[PDB]
């Protein structure tokens, strides 16, 4: 056994080392200079490692010391307002790391019996998602679609709506462009959401190991909150860019490629990363030192982001991620370019938690939309031949067109669960059936929304309680009848 080793070869951010007989899998390995590498490929008489940083300065012969543990990272309540590196190095600008303790990037997910059944909602703000693809703490919704369908816009918008709900947020930018990322956080600041979300970053130029590890690092930071009876929302932007980076590594390490030249263990990669996200029972009071009560429950909601090419949803990486997440929101490029802005496609989308991860009143009044939408799905074919059909089914078509014209919002305008009023009693009666034509079918939205701020005490009431029975329904019925005496 030996502690040290020397660099035999170095190319493409990968180093093949001789000796270093004592060396573990995934173990850190300190190179000359300050930067480390990762022992991912220990063959006999040679160990390949991935340089976590620039690799140009490294060379032959250099003494390489073995080290103690694996990749760790700064985690804590202090990271919130900060933009951080993959290693937790503040590229933000403030400078100092107000961090509390360290934690491993790669670490097992809480097993069964440690889980609590998910049943509390995390509002995305969008009428479209919150009503028919509900999300809840401890869940993992896969946002997926072609380029430019509005994926990220949906993601950070869901983050922005947590600016006030108590959930802490994490944004793992991977393979992204620096110019773009700054733009994003700049807008996270225009709204009060930045002081409430840590942004991890692995720009398009950083090493393959840095991008490939970025999600896990940002995870351990979010796990911090869940392990201590609190809720958090992490979003891995471009989980696709991550797998392409890991593919680069496995190829340089000469590992057998499967379909699309991707490593066979790619599924396993995302698998363990995503099982990390979950709700954990209050009896996780036993923590780093059981346990400052801690009568509370904790969770970590994570919605990853896959990017499909030309709608090919059966490609290798997408196939894996869709199979993993307990729900996925498909964004269509056709819905988008048309005008349906939250380009969500119902019927194909899904949320295996469903009604549970939804407020009480939403659970009731969303049921009407789900079927009203589903019938419009069946008659969509006749839309070309409309006017050929009798009024019976003709009206169902109009209701469908309107109800889908209703489920579309401007980008940075989350809704108040008073969206409840709008959505719910769009279905109750054709308050849209009057005066349908779709042009007005939206300007009515922004009008019902603000004449409720007229008498909103009976509205913030429905907001806080997150519940409805009958009185509230009765009131709601009258609020609209009282409505059309305006505009």
């Amino acid at each position: 056994a030996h502690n040290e080793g020397t660099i035999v070869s170095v190319s493409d951010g990968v180093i093949r080392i001789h000796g270093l007989a004592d060396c573990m899998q995934g173990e850190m390995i300190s190179l000359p200079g300050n930067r480390y590498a990762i022992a991912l490929n220990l063959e006999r008489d040679s160990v390949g490692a991935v340089v976590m940083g620039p690799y140009a300065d490294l060379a032959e012969g250099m003494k390489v010391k073995c080290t103690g543990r694996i990749l760790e990272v700064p985690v804590g309540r202090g990271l919130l307002g900060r933009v951080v590196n993959t290693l937790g190095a503040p590229i933000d600008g403030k400078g100092p790391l107000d961090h509390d303790g360290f934690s491993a990037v790669e670490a097992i997910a809480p097993g069964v019996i440690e889980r609590q059944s998910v049943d509390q909602p995390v509002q995305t703000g969008y009428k479209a998602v919150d009503s028919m693809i509900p999300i809840g703490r401890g869940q993992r919704e896969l946002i997926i679609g072609d380029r430019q369908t509005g994926k990220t816009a949906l993601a950070i918008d869901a983050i922005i709506n947590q600016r006030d709900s108590g959930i802490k947020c994490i944004y793992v930018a991977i393979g992204q462009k620096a110019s773009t990322i700054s733009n994003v956080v700049r807008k996270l600041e225009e709204h009060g959401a930045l002081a409430n979300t840590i942004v991890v970053v692995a720009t398009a130029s950083e090493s393959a190991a840095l991008q490939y590890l970025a999600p896990y690092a940002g995870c351990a930071m979010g796990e911090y909150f869940r392990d201590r009876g609190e809720d958090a929302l992490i979003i891995y932007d471009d989980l696709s860019k991550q797998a392409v980076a890991y593919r680069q590594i496995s190829l340089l390490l000469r590992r057998p490629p499967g379909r699309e030249a991707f490593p066979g263990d790619v599924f396993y990669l995302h698998s363990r990363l995503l099982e990390r996200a979950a709700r954990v029972n209050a009896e996780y009071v036993e923590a780093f030192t059981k346990g400052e009560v801690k009568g509370k429950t904790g969770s970590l909601t994570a919605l990853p982001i896959i990017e499909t090419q030309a709608g090919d949803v059966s490609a290798f990486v997408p196939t894996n991620v869709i199979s993993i997440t307990d729900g996925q929101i498909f964004l269509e490029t056709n819905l988008f370019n048309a005008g349906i802005r939250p380009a969500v496609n119902p019927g194909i989308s899904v949320s295996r938690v469903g009604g549970a991860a939804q407020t009480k009143i939403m659970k009731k009044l969303s049921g009407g939309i789900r079927t009203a939408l589903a019938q419009y799905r069946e008659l969509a074919a006749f839309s070309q031949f409309a006017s050929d059909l009798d009024d019976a089914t003709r009206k169902q078509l109009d209701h469908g067109q309107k109800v889908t014209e209703l489920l579309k919002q401007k980008q940075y305008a989350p809704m108040s669960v008073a969206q409840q009023s709008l959505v719910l009693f769009a279905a109750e009666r054709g308050y849209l059936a009057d005066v349908e034509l779709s042009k007005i079918g939206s300007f009515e939205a922004a009008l019902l929304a603000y004449v409720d701020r007229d008498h909103a005490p009976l509205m913030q009431e429905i907001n806080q309680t997150g519940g409805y029975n009958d009185e509230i329904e009765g009131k709601l019925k009258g609020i609209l009848d009282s409505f059309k005496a305006t505009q």
Partner: protein, 458 residues
């Protein structure tokens, strides 16, 4: 008595003194400090050397580590001692409860039961869900496939099949969660204890985050348990959670093991893997193990090798529908596409085969009528036609029903229906006595006896 030489991902390989060296599929123990993780021999390549897969995380492992050559393949506790709680790929309990009561400790590995087993065998297991019994009769030793995309209700439908066969009959249930989600594993365990059902249901989880070699074997483990219950001479059921994640997990193994890919990148042995898993599930002379397995379809494409090689083994196929579910019907099965190699008259009686085909027939005619009803309205149908449509509309809702495991969702009380109540219901509702009551009476109910009651409240 050996030392790790190379290690890549879950592909650790160990060297030994020649002769003695581990047989293939042989187990291997090895310490990495915190705990001992097991290895399974996969390839006896070269002299003295052996390729294996880590059953746990291969992290922390290093060259030269001591690997203890165990004798037998994987070891797993069988018998009634298993019924009562969860347990990972290799026997050990994960429920934090006591330790497995006892074990003859069988091997997860197999042998095809010689074709000396007691078919003929028509015992028409009553589930009993109206639609899954009226349209999809299946016998002991048979295997049923639940087809559908995500969110159709494959898993929850299995939960019901377990609870019903458990309490309304004898439990006899083994649940193999091949690569199963953790959240599902929890709600399942909780829902199973909420109802008396938990025994008999021996749970065998193989969480998604566990290595491929781990998730692959999870099927054989849960299989081996029910494989012994049949030895005891009892008619047990076996629910494999995802036939897809079985083949897919088996794909990863073949991948990093270096095998040449084939159809769509699947393992070059996909046929045989599915072959052995499926073949030991039958009705032997002594006992029987019946199976209902969720077959996920990627991109809703039945040509994909995963659900493709599955079809050859199913005795009956229950297709669920994401769109049927959207419209509110939650035993969300399409009566028109659900099939059963057993649904012929001399197997299931005439009354059954007749009312079965009749429901099929009427559901079909409505489909044809549906076209003219949109274009030139309902007023165009003859009195007999608009009678067929009213009568069909009714039977549609009738074959939906509140599951017992569904109460956490709807709140309504679930209801078990016999095979004879069902037939007695559908036959009449289409002959058709209950024309005087509104559709909603048939929406979510047991036999029409309840439907007529709800019809009074109306």
């Amino acid at each position: 008595t050996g030392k790790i030489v190379q290690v890549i991902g879950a592909v650790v390989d160990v060297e030994f003194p020649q002769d003695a060296v581990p047989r293939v599929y042989d187990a291997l123990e090895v310490q990495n400090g915190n705990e001992r993780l097991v290895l399974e021999v996969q390839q006896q390549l070269g002299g003295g050397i052996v390729r294996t897969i880590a059953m746990g995380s291969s992290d922390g492992l290093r060259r030269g580590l001591d690997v203890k050559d165990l004798e037998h393949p994987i070891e797993v506790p069988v018998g009634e001692a298993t019924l009562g709680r969860i347990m990972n790929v290799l026997g050990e309990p994960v429920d934090m409860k006591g330790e497995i009561g006892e074990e003859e400790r069988w091997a997860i590995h197999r042998a095809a039961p010689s074709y000396e087993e007691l078919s003929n065998s028509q015992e028409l297991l009553e589930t009993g869900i109206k639609v899954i019994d009226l349209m999809c009769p299946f016998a002991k030793g048979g295997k049923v496939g639940l087809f559908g995309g995500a969110g159709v209700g494959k898993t929850v439908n299995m939960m019901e099949l377990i609870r019903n066969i458990a309490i309304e009959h004898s439990g006899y249930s083994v649940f193999a969660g091949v690569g199963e989600r953790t959240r599902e594993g929890n709600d399942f365990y909780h829902e199973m204890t909420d109802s008396n059902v938990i025994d008999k249901v021996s749970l065998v989880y193989g969480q998604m985050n566990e290595p491929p070699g781990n998730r692959l074997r999870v099927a054989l483990t849960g299989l081996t348990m029910a494989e012994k219950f049949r030895d005891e001479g009892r008619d047990v059921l076996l629910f494999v959670d995802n036939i897809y994640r079985y083949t897919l997990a088996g794909t990863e193994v073949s991948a990093l093991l270096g095998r040449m890919p084939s159809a769509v990148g699947y393992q070059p042995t996909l046929a045989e893997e599915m072959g052995v898993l499926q073949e030991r599930i039958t009705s032997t002379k002594t006992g029987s193990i019946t199976s209902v397995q969720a077959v996920y379809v990627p991109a809703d494409d039945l040509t994909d090798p995963s659900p493709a090689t599955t079809f050859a083994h199913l005795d009956a196929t229950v297709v669920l529908s994401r769109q049927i579910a959207s419209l509110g019907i939650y035993p969300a099965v399409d009566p028109l596409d659900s099939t059963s190699r057993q649904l012929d008259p001399l197997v299931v009686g005439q009354e059954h085969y007749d009312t079965a085909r009749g429901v099929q027939s009427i559901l079909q005619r409505y489909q044809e009528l549906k076209d003219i009803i949109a274009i030139l309205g309902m007023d165009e149908l003859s009195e007999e036609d608009k009678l067929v449509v009213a009568r069909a509309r009714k039977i549609q809702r009738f074959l939906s029903q509140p599951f017992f495991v569904a109460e956490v969702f709807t709140g309504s009380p679930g209801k078990y229906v016999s095979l004879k109540d069902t037939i007695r219901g559908f036959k009449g509702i289409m002959e058709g006595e209950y024309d005087h009551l509104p559709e909603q009476a048939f929406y979510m109910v047991g036999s029409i006896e309840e439907a007529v009651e709800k019809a009074k409240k109306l």
